[PDB]
Design a protein around this ligand. Structure first.
Ligand SMILES: *[C@@H]1O[C@H](CO)[C@@H](O[C@@H]2O[C@H](CO)[C@@H](O)[C@H](O)[C@H]2NC(C)=O)[C@H](O)[C@H]1NC(C)=O
Ligand SMILES: *[C@@H]1O[C@H](CO)[C@@H](O[C@@H]2O[C@H](CO)[C@@H](O)[C@H](O)[C@H]2NC(C)=O)[C@H](O)[C@H]1NC(C)=O
Ligand SMILES: *[C@@H]1O[C@H](CO)[C@@H](O[C@@H]2O[C@H](CO)[C@@H](O)[C@H](O)[C@H]2NC(C)=O)[C@H](O)[C@H]1NC(C)=O
Ligand SMILES: *[C@@H]1O[C@H](CO)[C@@H](O[C@@H]2O[C@H](CO)[C@@H](O)[C@H](O)[C@H]2NC(C)=O)[C@H](O)[C@H]1NC(C)=O
Ligand SMILES: Cc1csc(N(C(=O)CSc2ccc(-c3ccccc3)nn2)C2CC2)n1
Ligand SMILES: Cc1csc(N(C(=O)CSc2ccc(-c3ccccc3)nn2)C2CC2)n1
Lengths: 542, 542
């Protein structure tokens, strides 16, 4: 018999789950590659679909009748059980796999940056190859998932504390990054980046960045010159003409917040796979490039385009259902779910916009698209923006991913119990009537096993678009259910009196159905096929 | 009401399906990497498991009661329907996917070698990237699969003709390769291979193989010297010391059949990924190797070991069920299936052994492990062994793969109909009572759709071990069923009177159950789980 109210019941969980980790790490890459304007447009599109879905859900919940079950109950009541069951099952699978991926990301964040100094779990995998890190993940993520499932098994009263602490840490990290940005505007930090000609080269091989140097009144080896130039004598031009013709120089990578940098970084620059990231302002002579010289540069990892960028970014904006599916507590959910969801979504969108604009206007353009940090000692560029130190941002990202995973894991069992509580799927009957007070039991086991299988895979990033397709399908179905319910003599209305809600819901449904289509039609077809199969099975069961 | 007799009914299909294409292309790689002795041992192990399964099947069929259905009916009658249904379903899936992979391999053989000159289907894909070839396959394989399904739909009376022609072509290719081997023993061909120091380098960049040459009474550019050495003047040692210190030379790659080559090629040589294949007899100085010089060599593709080699080779020895599942024709199958299966299996094993020994004793060891042909103009080494020309061997391989795919496609519907003919699986009832005369109809559609999905994947090589696991599970279950049936008061006995059949079946079952385990336990666990799920579903249906 829980009742979590509005603020903690539906606002904090949604905001905490929405943030993810894309803001801390991939946001700089996106802004650098697509420019400020295109990044703003893409974030606006994603937030627009999410806000339209939230508004449709609020309109549906205005009736104040949802007793239990998340969006699945609403969809089943409005449209019909046959579609509602399939949508709920797909959404539950997506939520479980998203929780698994969040936990994996948190574990890998911890391994790479959190405590690599403590052997970076070297005994766990010994770093023989990528398999070593994969095993380290497969073990540590499982060790953490067991604890997460154990904690979530107890009533949510003991779950909201950890989520609140994680959200507090994430907010602290965001405030620190903004303070670092303002300080850089008032006092730029130090962050040298090595650029030869007008290109950029990873500063991980040579100790110093200079074609020639003088030690003991004599020319030096110039380790940089040693690479791509095997002649250790100054009076020699044997190696590639690029070194001799072009010139090497060092430029700040974090010139702070200034009008010039932001204005120069406005437009976008998409590069195909294998290209070399190079600044445009400074000069560079043209000469043939030796094949061996290619590795000693900065090369794009994947092709860059608006559609691919939108597909990559969209998942970071999902998870608005944390406060929707969770309905056991929060008495009088009618007056709580919509306001909380809208507030959290709007705050997240505003923070995303401000962060993207600041990143565009603060950091040097060349560094931004230098993904993986190979350009500068592989260290986190955004971390240096943090006021105190990169540790604050790294720990913030780790806690954010862990908390998002925990919130998704907590949410999934409620939806599973709601689906099974109704005799809609014959073989899910046992997964109902959990512990007293309505807590989900005997379904937490199923969700935990699903997450454990996902962890055992330890490569869920391969099937990235499947979860996005599931989430978009659920949102589109919610929008359509709201539209039909309003059409079919729905008295539920906000203070504004009009029929424009029909058009709004249709616009959102079309918008981020085409969104999923452009993201990956290849997997959208598979997701639609799975939904159809579940719908046919439901029809057979009747 | 068909009756195909013994020879054509059960012998020709099994033998023509067993051959595959591994003999023509990968056999040389296996013999070169693992040596003659280890290749003989591995082929012996695979053929031993296959022959033990065949003998167990013959013992079971000695009762002369199998009216219809392949190994599934035997297993269900002996052990029990619960296991039989699951084993039959897994075997049917494996056969369908094997047919799809065979058709894909045939299409890719045609694209790469059959008719690349006819634009190599350039308009189909334009060769923009690997996606171009993938689309070419996805289209041509479907175009061929539609025709294959259409032909197989008609009674087998119109199917055995194409299989007979394909088997005739394959036998012609085998005879040609043996004749070429004997001729090389009596008259070695010409096949220069470029070796620097004691290593080997692909002869695809430079026109001639010589560190220096004289044209117009002057030193030449020496294109080979241009690669890895960018100084175009003879009086210069700027480039890597390997070229100057070591010496480059040309050696025959096909010295014919001689005692020395075979004796020197006896022992094995396993190399880890990234290694460089080098001969042992000739000398080679030691000096540092430049990083850029690495690509201009011959590098192993994957790690080499006995277990991985056995796992790779085993699928080339399966398919002995072609004459077993097909039982609609061949009246009095009791006196036909065992003799035909044993004869075909023994002939295939003998041909494999002889071919491996000849390959070991004929071709130069260095070339053998030069997979993909990059060592010598990417052209098929085994093709040059053919007496008339490589075209005979290439067409033989293409026809062999096409025929194997066609035979598997023909076999699958019979097993599907047999499974559905019995009300064991509730939802397979519709897939029964095909066209008159017992021909499979309304199940050929399902098998064709499964094959079409596999083609659309066009990358079935990724899940290679799954089909191997399915086949090994089916064979092991057949062996266990034979053992139990003989134990449970089975009067079926051959002229030899003894109870050693129990021990023989147990030995085979253990042998190539551990075979699948060593091949891939990772996927063996998944296959076992799928079989258990099918068994539980069957139990529920009762
Ligand atoms: C890299 O070195 C070149 C050297 O030419 C610089 O271009 C100028 O070249 C003239 C020719 O002797 C010199 O007198 C100038 O001193 C050079 N300019 C400078 C600033 O040194 C080129 O400018 C150098 N790179 C950069 C970024 O300045
Ligand atoms: C860095 O330098 C390159 C080349 O110097 C410039 O981009 C063009 O590159 C082509 C090479 O095919 C040159 O022919 C052009 O002269 C270069 N400038 C143009 C086309 O305006 C550019 O300065 C930089 N390239 C980037 C930033 O991608
Ligand atoms: C590659 O060239 C070397 C050159 O040293 C050959 O080794 C011998 O070196 C001496 C030293 O001058 C020469 O007089 C000999 O003529 C060289 N031998 C030969 C056969 O030319 C080395 O033998 C050469 N490579 C091969 C495979 O013979
Ligand atoms: C080809 O040459 C290599 C090296 O010259 C020989 O294998 C050994 O390689 C190591 C390199 O670390 C040398 O130190 C040894 O002197 C080489 N010979 C040995 C260990 O007996 C060998 O002749 C050839 N390598 C092959 C065939 O793999
Ligand atoms: C060390 C590190 C750096 S960056 C990083 N990352 C993360 O920590 C995120 S892992 C992740 C990815 C996707 C999803 C997801 C959620 C909902 C729907 C679809 C997908 N969830 N979680 C990933 C590469 C960006 N790890
Ligand atoms: C151009 C070319 C060269 S070599 C080649 N190959 C082929 O043509 C064979 S494609 C193939 C592979 C596996 C199976 C199979 C059958 C039964 C059970 C498990 C696997 N069937 N078919 C493949 C790489 C060797 N193509």
């Amino acid at each position: 018999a829980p009742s979590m109210g509005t603020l903690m019941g539906v606002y904090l969980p949604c905001l905490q789950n929405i943030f993810g980790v894309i803001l801390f790490l991939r946001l700089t890459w996106m802004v650098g590659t697509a420019g400020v304007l295109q990044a703003l447009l893409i974030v606006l599109i994603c937030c627009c679909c999410t806000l339209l879905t939230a508004i449709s859900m609020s309109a549906i919940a205005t009736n104040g009748v949802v007793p239990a079950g998340g969006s699945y109950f609403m969809i089943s009541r409005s449209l019909g059980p046959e579609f509602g069951g399939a949508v709920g099952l797909c959404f539950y699978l997506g939520t479980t796999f998203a929780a698994a991926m969040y936990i994996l990301g948190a574990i890998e964040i911890l391994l790479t940056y959190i405590a690599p100094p403590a052997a970076i779990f070297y005994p766990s995998g010994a770093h023989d190859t990528s398999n070593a890190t994969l095993n380290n993940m497969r073990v540590y993520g499982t060790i953490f998932l067991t604890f997460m499932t154990l904690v979530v098994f107890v009533g949510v009263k003991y779950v909201n504390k950890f989520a609140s602490l994680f959200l507090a840490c994430v907010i602290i990290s965001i405030l620190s990054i903004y303070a670092g940005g303002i300080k850089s505007i008032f006092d730029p930090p130090v962050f040298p980046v090595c650029m030869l000609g007008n290109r950029t080269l990873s500063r991980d091989q040579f100790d110093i960045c200079a074609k020639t140097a003088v030690v003991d009144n004599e020319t030096v080896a110039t380790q940089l010159w040693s690479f791509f130039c095997h002649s250790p004598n100054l009076t020699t031009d044997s190696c590639d003409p690029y070194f001799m013709l072009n010139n090497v120089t060092e430029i700040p990578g974090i010139p702070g917040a200034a009008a010039g940098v932001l204005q120069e970084n406005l437009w976008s620059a998409y590069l195909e796979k294998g290209d070399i990231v190079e600044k445009h302002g400074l000069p560079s002579a043209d000469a043939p490039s030796l094949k061996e010289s290619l590795p000693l540069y900065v090369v794009a990892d994947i092709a860059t385009s608006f559609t691919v960028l939108v597909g990559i970014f969209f998942p970071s904006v999902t998870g608005i259902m944390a406060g929707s599916n969770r309905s056991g507590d929060l008495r009088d959910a009618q007056k709580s779910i919509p306001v909380g969801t809208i507030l959290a979504i709007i705050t997240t969108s505003l923070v995303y916009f401000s962060s993207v604009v600041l990143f565009g206007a603060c950091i040097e353009g060349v560094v931004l698209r230098d993904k993986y940090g190979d350009g500068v000692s592989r260290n986190l560029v955004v971390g240096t923006l943090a006021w105190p130190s990169p540790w604050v941002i790294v720990i913030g990202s780790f806690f954010s991913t862990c908390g998002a995973g925990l919130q998704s894991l907590t949410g999934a069992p409620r939806l599973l119990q709601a689906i099974a509580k109704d005799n809609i799927i014959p073989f899910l009957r046992v997964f109902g009537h959990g512990k007293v007070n309505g807590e989900p039991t005997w379904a937490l086991l199923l969700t935990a096993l699903i997450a454990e299988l996902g962890i055992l895979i330890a490569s869920l990033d391969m099937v990235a678009p499947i979860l996005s397709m599931f989430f978009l399908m659920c949102y589109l179905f919610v929008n359509l259910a709201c539209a039909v319910q309003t059409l079919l003599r729905t008295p539920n209305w906000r203070p504004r009196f009009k029929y424009y809600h029909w058009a709004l819901s249709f616009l959102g449904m079309s918008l981020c159905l085409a969104l999923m289509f452009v993201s990956s039609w290849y997997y959208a077809l598979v997701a639609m096929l799975i939904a159809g199969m579940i719908y046919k099975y439901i029809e057979y069961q009747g």
